[PDB]
Amino acid sequence: YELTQPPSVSVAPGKTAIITCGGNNIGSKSVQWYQRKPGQAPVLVIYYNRDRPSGIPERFSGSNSGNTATLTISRVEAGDEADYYCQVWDRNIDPHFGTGTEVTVLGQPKANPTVTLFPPSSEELQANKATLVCLISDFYPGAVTVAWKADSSPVKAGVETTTPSKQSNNKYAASSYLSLTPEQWKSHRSYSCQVTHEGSTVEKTVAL
Amino acid sequence: QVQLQESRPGLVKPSETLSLSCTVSGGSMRSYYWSWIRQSPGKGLEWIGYVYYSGGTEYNPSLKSRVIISVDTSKNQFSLNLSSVSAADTAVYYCARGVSALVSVDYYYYYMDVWGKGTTVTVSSASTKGPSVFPLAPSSKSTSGGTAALGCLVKDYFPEPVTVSWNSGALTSGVHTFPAVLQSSGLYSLSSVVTVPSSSLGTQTYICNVNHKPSNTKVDKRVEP
Numbered sequence: 001y002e003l004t005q006p007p008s009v010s011v012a013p014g015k016t017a018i019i020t021c022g023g024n025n026i027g028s029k030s031v032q033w034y035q036r037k038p039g040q041a042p043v044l045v046i047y048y049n050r051d052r053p054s055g056i057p058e059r060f061s062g063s064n065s066g067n068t069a070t071l072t073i074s075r076v077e078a079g080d081e082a083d084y085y086c087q088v089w090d091r092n093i094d095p096h097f098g099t100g101t102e103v104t105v106l107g108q109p110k111a112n113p114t115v116t117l118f119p120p121s122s123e124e125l126q127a128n129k130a131t132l133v134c135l136i137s138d139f140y141p142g143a144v145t146v147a148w149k150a151d152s153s154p155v156k157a158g159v160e161t162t163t164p165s166k167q168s169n170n171k172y173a174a175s176s177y178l179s180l181t182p183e184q185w186k187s188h189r190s191y192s193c194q195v196t197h198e199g200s201t202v203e204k205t206v207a208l
Numbered sequence: 209q210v211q212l213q214e215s216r217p218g219l220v221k222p223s224e225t226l227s228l229s230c231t232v233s234g235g236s237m238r239s240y241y242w243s244w245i246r247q248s249p250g251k252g253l254e255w256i257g258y259v260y261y262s263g264g265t266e267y268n269p270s271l272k273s274r275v276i277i278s279v280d281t282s283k284n285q286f287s288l289n290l291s292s293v294s295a296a297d298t299a300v301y302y303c304a305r306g307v308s309a310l311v312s313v314d315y316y317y318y319y320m321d322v323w324g325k326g327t328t329v330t331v332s333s334a335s336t337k338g339p340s341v342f343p344l345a346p347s348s349k350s351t352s353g354g355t356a357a358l359g360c361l362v363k364d365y366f367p368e369p370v371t372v373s374w375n376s377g378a379l380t381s382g383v384h385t386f387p388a389v390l391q392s393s394g395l396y397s398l399s400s401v402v403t404v405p406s407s408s409l410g411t412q413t414y415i416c417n418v419n420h421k422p423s424n425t426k427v428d429k430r431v432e433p
Contacts, residue, residue, distance in 0.1 A: 030317030034253070041302060041326050042245075042253065047319035048309065085253050089306075090317040094266060095243075095255040116357050116401060121342040124361075133344060133361055133399050137384055160389045175386045177397060 003086055003098040012106045017073040019101045021086030024067060030090040031069040033062060036100075037082045038166045045084075046071060073103070078170045081105055110198065111171055113139035117193045117204035120185055130185040132178040132206065134193035138171045139164075146176040147194040150184075155191070210235035212303050214327035218422035219367045220297075222333055226290040230303030230324055233284065237261050241306030242279060242286040243320060246299040254299075258306055259286055293331045300326040330367040337395060338423035339365035341416070343431040344399065350406045358431045359401035360416035364393070365423070372400035373417045379404075409433050 004022040011017040021031065033046035044053055046062035049069065059080075061072045073080055086098040114137045120130040136144055143164055148155040161176040176193060185191075190207040215229045230242070244256040257267035259277040267275050271290070279286040290297060305322040344359035362370050372385045379402060388398035400416055418427040 030319075032319045034320075036247075036253075041323045042247075042320075043323070044319055044321050047321075048317050053321065087320075089319070091315055094268075095258075095318075097253045097255060100252045118344045118359065118361075118399075121345065121361070124342045124363075127340075129363075131342075131361060131363065131397070133359075135359075135384075135386055135399060135401055160391050162387055162389045165387045173384065173386055175389055175399060177389050177391070179391070 001088075001093060001096055003088065003096055005084075005086060005098040005101045007099070008102045008104060010104050010106055011073075011076050013077055014075055017076050017080070017103055019071040019073070019084050019086075019103065021069040021071070021098045022067060023069075023088065023096075023098075026067055026069050026088065027065040029088040029093055031062065031064045032087040032089065033060075033071045034085045034087065035082045036085065042085070076103075076105055078105055078108065081166075081170055105170075108140055108170060111138055111140035112200070113137065113144060113195050113197050113202060115193065115195050115202045115204050117206050119191075119206040119208070120182070125182050125185070128182060130180045130182050132180070132185075132191055132193070134176040134178070134195070134204070136174045136176070136195050137167070138169075138173070139197050140171045141198050142172055143197075144172075144174055145196045146174070147196070148176070148178050149192045149194065150188045151190060210305065210322050212305065212322055212324035214301065214303055214324045216421045217328040217367075217369055219330045219332045219334070219336055220293050222294055222331055223292055226293050226297065226329060226331075227287065228301055228303075228327065228329075229285050229287045231283075231285050232305075237279065237281050237284055237286075239308075241308065241318065242277075243304045243306045244277060244288045245302045245304055245320070247302070247326075248299040251299065256288065256290075256301075295331050298329060298331045300328050302326050328367075328369045332367060334366060334394060336422050337364065337366045338425040339363060339370065339418060339420050339427065341418050341427040341429045343416075343429055344401065345431060346409065346433050348433065352403075354406050355403050356406045356409055356433075357401055357403050358414055358433075359399050360418060360429050360431060361397065361399050362418050362420075363397045364391070364395045365397075365420055366395050367422055368396060369421075370396075370398060371419045371421075372398075374400070374402050375413075375415055376417055379414070 034042040049064035050062040243258040304320040346356035346358040385400040388396040
């Protein structure tokens with residue numbers, strides 16, 4: 001037995017998000033729905049097709065009939081963005097999960113990144129190592145590219161940059177690190193971390 | 209209220225057996241179907257199996273040949289052993305409480321209401337390595353209009369995860385812990401930063417509390433201007 005779900009569902013705020021779960025004769029099996037936000041454990045939002053555990057808002061409603069069960073989210077808000085998994089589990093079938101539907105809410109306002117740049121600590125330098133740390137937070141359109149410079153020249157080799165990761169507020173965060181020797185660090189006049197977001201760039205500089 | 213706590217995260221070597229436990233606190237193990245579920249990106253949620261209070265088990269057919277679940281009611285614990293692991297078994301493993309609900313003499317249903325927090329398991333032939341923690345001192349003067357950004361760099365550890373708190377959990381406002389970067393050495397580094405009022409640098413001590421459970425190491429680093 002196998003349950004199918006659409007990969008994603010896009011909805012504007014205040015409107016109604018409809019998530020579907022396909023399975024042969026699913027209408028005669030008890031469907032549960034689980035919500036999972038990034039970095040968090042799953043939360044039961046619907047059991048026995050339509051029942052809500054204590055504290056789940058009535059905006060979340062469940063239906064089940066025929067070959068399709070549905071999770072309806074009325075008056076959607078940014079806090080509802082998550083991965084939603086359907087499940088069947090009852091007397092007549094062992095637990096099966098759907099593939100998961102990610103809900104994204106449209107029209108969120110773009111946000112330019114905040115950039116914080118740290119030089120190597122004195123502790124790290126006396127351990128004969130050096131790391132520049134470029135922390136990027138609170139950008140929304142979703143992605144960034146990071147470039148590094150020593151004085152005015154592009155530095156690659158030593159650069160590692162994370163994928164963007166969803167924050168609490170549905171904005172995104174990322175990090176970029178430049179590894180170098182203590183001699184590289186003290187030989188130049190400055191280093192810069194340059195973060196490009198939607199054709200515009202924020203540059204921070206540090207010096208020894 | 210019932211709480212479930214998985215055993216410590218860390219690595220399992222390829223071809224060895226992954227062994228996890230879950231401790232149930234705040235409640236009894238009777239009546240319930242104690243379940244293991246795992247998650248990894250693209251993999252969604254996968255049910256592994258469950259053990260009823262008294263010892264009976266039920267397993268995912270695709271894993272039944274490699275999986276044993278058992279229960280120790282004397283310690284309010286149940287366990288998972290997954291043998292002959294490979295990279296395909298890298299995942300976050302959850303314990304959960306399965307509940308049965310009777311509808312009629314010939315129909316009942318189940319749901320998983322209480323979940324553990326998840327434990328991150330990495331299948332890897334590499335070695336566990338505890339972190340080196342360095343302070344990220346706030347600049348001598350603010351460049352943000354009156355706030356100071358300070359942090360801790362947690363360098364060169366393996367495997368995931370690391371957790372960071374500040375002032376033993378008393379400081380939560382303005383804390384941002386960034387997901388780790390994987391360096392070309394194959395080790396992870398991450399940073400946690402807190403933004404505080406500039407004046408508090410004279411009146412408040414700032415200490416980041418770094419926990420790397422895989423290496424049984426905790427570091428409390430004072431961050432001074």
